[PDB]
Amino acid sequence: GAMGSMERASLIQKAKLAEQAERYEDMAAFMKGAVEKGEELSCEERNLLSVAYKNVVGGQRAAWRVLSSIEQKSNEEGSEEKGPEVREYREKVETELQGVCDTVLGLLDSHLIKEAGDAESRVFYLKMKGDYYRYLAEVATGDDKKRIIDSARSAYQEAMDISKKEMPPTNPIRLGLALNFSVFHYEIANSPEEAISLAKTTFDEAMADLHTLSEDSYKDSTLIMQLLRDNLTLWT
């Protein structure tokens, strides 16, 4: 790897600089280099890794949606044939997106998840595994779409089982996992009722635990609760 010669601490420092500069591709490459040093990641370092790849894949997903919409309109009746270019370029963006997801999934499998023993790290990584399989599922159409969806579901489910046993209902990692699993149910798994039920139960159990929190923790938890409510408002 091109980051193999850089110190772990220097890679982390540069990832933080890249974030300030909105250079998320650089940020992800620095954090990949840091993971490949082989040491476990701290809470702050896990968040840097997630922010970097979330921004990279977010740009790819947005571009893929634009191109997919153009491609489907070209297949409507009355549409003028324009040749292979729209499909080719959508496929180009799609392949790049799949490559980023495969990179993240590879870091999780070699070897972040297997060394993560604490609930906070293990749930974080399993949620990430669910998220990246979910992004693969958004573009999947072939022999493996079903297996990709089940891989996302399985990772989210293992993360949920640990979170329910080991974390309070207001824990922001637990809340963000439930939020994203609910989005998986609604957008990927054709299960809007499961999505609504999960979001409602997560919100209500968090509500009942807010009294235990400091002012700062209260702000962290209620911010994510608002996203659950925003989805429930959209879905009902």
Binding site: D131, V183, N231
Partner: peptide
Amino acid sequence: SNSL
């Protein structure tokens, strides 16, 4: 839908 809004994810995290």
